[PDB]
Symmetry: C4
Subunit: 386 residues, 4 copies
Amino acid sequence: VKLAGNSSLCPVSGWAIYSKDNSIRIGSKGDVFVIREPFISCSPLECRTFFLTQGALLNDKHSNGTIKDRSPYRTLMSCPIGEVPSPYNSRFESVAWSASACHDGINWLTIGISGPDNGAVAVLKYNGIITDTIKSWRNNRLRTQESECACVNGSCFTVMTDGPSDGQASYKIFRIEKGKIVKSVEMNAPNYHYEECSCYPDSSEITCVCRDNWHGSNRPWVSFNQNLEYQIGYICSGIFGDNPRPNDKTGSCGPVSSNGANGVKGFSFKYGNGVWIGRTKSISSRNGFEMIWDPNGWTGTDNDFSIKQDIVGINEWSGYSGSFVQHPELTGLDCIRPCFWVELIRGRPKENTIWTSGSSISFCGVNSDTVGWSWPDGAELPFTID
Amino acid sequence: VKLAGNSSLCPVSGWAIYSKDNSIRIGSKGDVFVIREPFISCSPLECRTFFLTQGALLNDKHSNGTIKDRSPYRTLMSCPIGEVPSPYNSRFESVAWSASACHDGINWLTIGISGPDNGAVAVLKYNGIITDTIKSWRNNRLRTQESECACVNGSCFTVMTDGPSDGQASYKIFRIEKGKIVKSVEMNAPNYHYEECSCYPDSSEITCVCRDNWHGSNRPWVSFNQNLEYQIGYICSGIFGDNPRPNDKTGSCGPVSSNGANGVKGFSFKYGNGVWIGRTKSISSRNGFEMIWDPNGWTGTDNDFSIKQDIVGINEWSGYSGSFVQHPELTGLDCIRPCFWVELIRGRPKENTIWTSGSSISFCGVNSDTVGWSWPDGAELPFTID
Amino acid sequence: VKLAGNSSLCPVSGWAIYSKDNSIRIGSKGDVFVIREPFISCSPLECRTFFLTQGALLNDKHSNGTIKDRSPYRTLMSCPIGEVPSPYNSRFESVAWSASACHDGINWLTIGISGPDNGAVAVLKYNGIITDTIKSWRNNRLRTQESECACVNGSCFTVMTDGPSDGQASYKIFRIEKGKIVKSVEMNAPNYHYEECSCYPDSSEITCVCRDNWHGSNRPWVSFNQNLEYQIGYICSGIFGDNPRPNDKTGSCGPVSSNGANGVKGFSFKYGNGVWIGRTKSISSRNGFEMIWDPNGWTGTDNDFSIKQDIVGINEWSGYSGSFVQHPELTGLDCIRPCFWVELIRGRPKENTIWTSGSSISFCGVNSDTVGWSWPDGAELPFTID
Amino acid sequence: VKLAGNSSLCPVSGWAIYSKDNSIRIGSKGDVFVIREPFISCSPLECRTFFLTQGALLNDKHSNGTIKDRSPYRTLMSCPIGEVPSPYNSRFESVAWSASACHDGINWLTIGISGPDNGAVAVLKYNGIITDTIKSWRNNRLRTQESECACVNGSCFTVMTDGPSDGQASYKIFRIEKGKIVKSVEMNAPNYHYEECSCYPDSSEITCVCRDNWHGSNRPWVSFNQNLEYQIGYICSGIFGDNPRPNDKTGSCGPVSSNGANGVKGFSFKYGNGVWIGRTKSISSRNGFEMIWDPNGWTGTDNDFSIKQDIVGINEWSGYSGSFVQHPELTGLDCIRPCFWVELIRGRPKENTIWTSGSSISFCGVNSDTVGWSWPDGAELPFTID
Ligand SMILES: CC(=O)N[C@H]1[C@H]([C@H](O)[C@H](O)CO)OC(C(=O)O)=C[C@@H]1NC(=N)N
Ligand SMILES: CC(=O)N[C@H]1[C@H]([C@H](O)[C@H](O)CO)OC(C(=O)O)=C[C@@H]1NC(=N)N
Ligand SMILES: CC(=O)N[C@H]1[C@H]([C@H](O)[C@H](O)CO)OC(C(=O)O)=C[C@@H]1NC(=N)N
Ligand SMILES: CC(=O)N[C@H]1[C@H]([C@H](O)[C@H](O)CO)OC(C(=O)O)=C[C@@H]1NC(=N)N
Ligand SMILES: *[C@@H]1O[C@H](CO)[C@@H](O)[C@H](O)[C@H]1NC(C)=O
Ligand SMILES: *[C@@H]1O[C@H](CO)[C@@H](O)[C@H](O)[C@H]1NC(C)=O
Ligand SMILES: *[C@@H]1O[C@H](CO)[C@@H](O)[C@H](O)[C@H]1NC(C)=O
Ligand SMILES: *[C@@H]1O[C@H](CO)[C@@H](O)[C@H](O)[C@H]1NC(C)=O
Ligand SMILES: *[C@@H]1O[C@H](CO)[C@@H](O)[C@H](O)[C@H]1NC(C)=O
Ligand SMILES: *[C@@H]1O[C@H](CO)[C@@H](O)[C@H](O)[C@H]1NC(C)=O
Ligand SMILES: *[C@@H]1O[C@H](CO)[C@@H](O)[C@H](O)[C@H]1NC(C)=O
Ligand SMILES: *[C@@H]1O[C@H](CO)[C@@H](O)[C@H](O)[C@H]1NC(C)=O
Ligand SMILES: *[C@H]1O[C@H](CO)[C@@H](O)[C@H](O)[C@H]1NC(C)=O
Ligand SMILES: *[C@H]1O[C@H](CO)[C@@H](O)[C@H](O)[C@H]1NC(C)=O
Ligand SMILES: *[C@H]1O[C@H](CO)[C@@H](O)[C@H](O)[C@H]1NC(C)=O
Ligand SMILES: *[C@H]1O[C@H](CO)[C@@H](O)[C@H](O)[C@H]1NC(C)=O
Ligand SMILES: [Ca+2]
Ligand SMILES: [Ca+2]
Ligand SMILES: [Ca+2]
Ligand SMILES: [Ca+2]
């Protein structure tokens, strides 16, 4: 049966640890894929870990130069949550160097972008069967969420970006039914920059928190209903969400130009005028991670918060993060549960190796007692292959 | 429920990438079978990758001399599409150095040919249970499709060849029900040569595009109905389909003797008087791959085409190719979807190794935007074992 | 359907061997997790082996320093009984350095304790979904059974400990329904010490046999009904159950202070005034294992027994042991079958390696002919990595 | 539904190849169990390969001294037919150095014998749950079929042996229902020797062809009905079935004392007064294998045959062989199909290695065209570990 998506988000006071795979530690001897850009998505029965492979195993010579973002060898694959991405336990999804996946209640939807940087094609699959296609319309690295898409009342929604990563680009919202695109709208967003959106369903509508790689150290957001009537803006909080970023001063409801160039994929959960910000602890590199509750952060511009929860220590490597949700028809709850994952990147450019990969931790939002701690990657680099 | 097979082929303007396994790259460290002659076939539930193993793993000493075509150690096995052929994730099918497989809607049919070159026996299995047998009738390397068989209204059809590979041989069409041969007809084809046919269902009838190893650089074809009433001929197009071949001149509706000796397994889709030819880019070796749409290529002899789509680059290794189809009762579409796979051969005779193996890419025919690119094997030879 | 848990324990005269995984022997070359604290639990369909990983494989550098009890890399995972804990065949359960699991008849309940030693959090999952949480209330290493919990008429029960391991601590019994804590009671037990309880259902009530790490070489027990009305005491037998321990003299119904400090996790089955004691053969280290039937051992203090069955030889390594049960709705029997497992620890501190791990054997209680023997670990240390 | 077992054996003129695993060749690099005594058994859904592990992998140090027959580390495990016995794809069955397994139509029955040579215990499991037990009654290596048991109308039947292997021993037939022994009869067989019986169902009755290790180069047989009313005798054929054996002279209906000491496990199918003998090609060692049809071999004593089919070449290693059957409710046929497997032993005592193991081939009896050939093991010894 289709996921309704009409209920609100569950009240959350803390984040309980859900999964840890230990990919790089196990990959030291085991047959584990060299991956990056992992994300979690749930069906009514199970939650799966999606990831973009480099078509190579850890501690093997083919992992050479895997800092490279896009190649013909990259494939989207999935394994059960908390397990290592192995050739022996992973399910093939698509050929992709950029990806998105979600379950509507009946079947899996996957989106796999492959091809040249000037003509990339998104291949849409519903239950493993190709159902539609989208070509790059700006001929400049067609790219998508790198996290799960959002589904409401039988439709699934995604955001795609085409154009430069250091200037004004083109941003489109898609409405997809049974793997077929039924509607799409280009966003009227001058001076905005949307990339790698973390989108979640809330009260029959979708909220995406994205990455401004152009000139924003705070995060851009986009909200829309099923007809794709959207709103745009930035998170106003003085507690900035991207990386790199400045120190916490007064925030802006437009793009914070200071330390605005570059970025990292992230997420945030809106609760009225308040926001749950997940961010790196460091302001200059991808190190550490923390959940922060700013009761006025979504619309207000000050740098105040009432809750901080440690996830990864200041001196430990982190990386990508993203939102996922668990629906009522999975949990039995009457609200939509917010969860998140964190990618822990190891290797290049920061470490003296020939390779780049990442493992994953995940947390779910509860309304009971929790604790801050550091759950780092734990691998001892360099490897035999280095 | 049985596959009907009464509908036409879906209109196709381009080919979207469906799967890539990265077998040789992963096999560098992982436990991956040394294979050749892979093919894809689909049930109403899933698509599987079939392959002929050499009974040995990559980067192991037992892969020595695996350029050899036929041995007692070769077995037909299958794994899910896009996954690596591993001993830990593959299903055993038959003991075979030549194979064919297809799903009638209810159960899998596999055909496995093993035995001596002068008395080979095809073992037919329906749902894993031996249901029939065929002995070599010319005592000269009984061989079959190396791709999937075609099924229409509860029957499945195959083509087998017995005799020389550089002269006139014997060619038989088989009709199989629930694993048992109910009818067979020898083809009256003097001056023709049929080997390794790629067969597909279309409007309650079967079209096979095969390999003329004798004296044909263009491809032979055979069409038949359920009663095995057949027609024979060659693809008339001036864009020649086999490898090795000449340059593109005026074609013939008989065998093109020029560069006619030897060959490679291939496929083609008939659309009225038009043909979708898949072929190597090189004319002298198994390198590159491209899809070409000749609107008049099936019956006309000129060398004109209106669409060319790149699949594998001119300098990159390719190999075998074959057709597969997805039926309406799998896709939900009202037509039969044409797809294809490409084997990418690495090692002997062209490379300085002790072994020979191949990985696989696959594409499905869509009527929306697509792109040409190169999706090569990607392995760095020689291996530690060499 | 829910497990009733109203029937008695089956009469047992001997213990038949149920499973042996050979983890360390296979882990010498294979990809097997470095584990400790394994336990078995059964659903109405299957029995599974639960275990706490160190997030590393055997014979790999990441197994360095795995004598360490608690880390952020430890995860609770399960595989089918008798199989090796491998990344390729194991199911992820929780992030935990202390664990408990049980099936109520409908779904799995897992309890995973992770976090700092002064703020640890137990994460409760029902069918893989977080359903509740418990924080450390003494801020001193919140710890649980390391064996399966007990379930009766739709509820599941566990025991947790918080405080010192060489003095008076705090002990709580929990009643859990569908993953949610519905009732909890702190035990009024001055001069008692409860740790790592082996709990089993018997006649709609629960009996736990635990570990007194403080000052007891005999084992403490706690019995309770569904409303958590409990009784406390020690096993009176002169045949002492813990390790280290003294020689067999007259026992006490209170804690036997002699050789009382430290300990090991164990189990015992009450049959009226009689007890089935499972214990190490050695009195100073974790070596050997034996089942002993003392017809008066539960309430009487003498050192007499009528049955002794050998399990592991005196010179062979053992370790943890625990109870598990098989219910009527699994076996078809009209009573609850008692079974047990034994962890066989190899490596540090007793062996010259960089690592510590354990394999597992298991036995079930039958009322027919059996035999004593030694089923040791069988691995030849040190390993290549040492 | 229960297997009826009332129908006759299918008429067989030849043997088509069913499976080949290539265990030792793949085990050279892959993680494959060191095994011996493999056998095949089928349920109404699938056929499985059962095998006795040594609790160690090939090309690992723990495979040292695996020529040893009985240890505490040996376990009975099963994997799907034609697949390699791997820790990642195998199901655990029992702890055993002697085994038997069969499916009654509803659930699997396994028999696992472990323990000391003077007190061994057979542990009976039905659907993975211990249901009964048998102790050694002669205190001299209690041993069983090493092949599948036979099932008729809801009961399953086995043969066990206790006593010396070079003199008169004790032989018992068991009738088992739902894992419980309901009847057993000791065979009145003075001057006979029964070991490692291959038993099959035929017309509501069971025929076992066994091994005379004492003084018989021809094979002993035992037939019985469901009430265990038995007949005993030897295969009269002048074509002797065991190994070692003499040359083919006139046979005896009693034990052929000439070259009678020692032996190997085998099988034979009775068809009236005729017999399908499977045997090694060599008369002094375990080399080669062949199927021979003697139309008068069961009751007549001459050395004539009308069909010989090659299976393994004279210079290639063989080993154990055994019968298996496929029932009507699996095949859809109205008769019981006879099949067989062959173990191909490699290593000690005949080869310069530290280990001993075996791979497996299997054939099923068809009434259509077949071929003789050699399907050897194919591994190149010694291994890196030697
Ligand atoms: C499609 C693509 O190449 N996306 C890039 C991403 C991107 O370049 C930035 O957002 C700027 O546009 O950068 C990063 C990154 O780690 O910052 C990795 C992503 N790699 C992959 N998704 N494979
Ligand atoms: C049955 C058999 O040996 N088929 C051969 C095939 C064949 O020799 C040619 O078509 C000429 O007859 O050649 C090739 C080839 O790569 O050209 C591989 C096939 N190998 C395997 N299918 N194993
Ligand atoms: C939670 C925790 O650290 N438990 C410890 C346990 C414990 O220290 C003693 O019972 C004393 O309190 O000791 C041992 C032990 O081998 O004795 C291992 C356990 N390790 C793990 N369960 N990981
Ligand atoms: C139970 C047992 O040890 N059975 C032995 C078997 C036996 O010794 C002979 O039949 C003589 O009694 O010999 C052989 C053999 O290869 O000849 C292997 C078997 N090994 C195993 N089944 N593990
Ligand atoms: C969710 O959908 C159901 C079924 O349509 C309906 O009962 C309910 O109103 C929706 N939830 C909310 C919170 O409106
Ligand atoms: C990686 O690639 C670089 C250059 O492409 C080369 O110099 C180096 O040797 C490679 N390293 C390995 C381990 O293959
Ligand atoms: C396919 O078979 C169905 C059922 O027999 C029938 O409705 C239809 O006519 C067939 N399709 C075509 C295109 O004729
Ligand atoms: C492969 O075989 C050839 C001859 O058969 C031999 O000379 C060579 O050493 C072998 N190579 C390996 C790696 O086993
Ligand atoms: C077990 O529960 C069933 C169903 O409620 C009941 O028949 C029975 O009384 C209980 N068993 C015992 C031993 O009381
Ligand atoms: C283990 O760690 C110690 C110190 O932490 C170090 O000296 C040693 O080299 C390590 N051993 C291995 C095999 O990594
Ligand atoms: C097999 O059993 C069925 C059902 O009892 C019966 O029809 C038949 O007589 C039996 N088969 C034979 C060959 O007697
Ligand atoms: C095997 O064992 C023997 C003696 O038990 C020993 O001499 C030899 O070194 C061992 N070999 C290996 C490879 O472990
Ligand atoms: C979509 O589903 C049903 C039927 O189309 C409709 O009643 C429901 O309100 C719609 N979902 C929404 C509005 O989210
Ligand atoms: C075969 O199936 C049915 C019943 O035999 C028949 O009606 C149908 O037309 C046949 N299939 C064809 C002609 O493709
Ligand atoms: C709990 O289950 C049912 C319904 O609540 C009740 O009848 C039964 O007696 C209770 N279980 C017990 C007392 O163990
Ligand atoms: C056993 O099964 C049924 C019911 O007990 C009986 O009718 C049948 O004849 C028996 N099976 C035999 C005789 O093989
Ligand atoms: Ca930015
Ligand atoms: Ca040719
Ligand atoms: Ca103690
Ligand atoms: Ca003999």
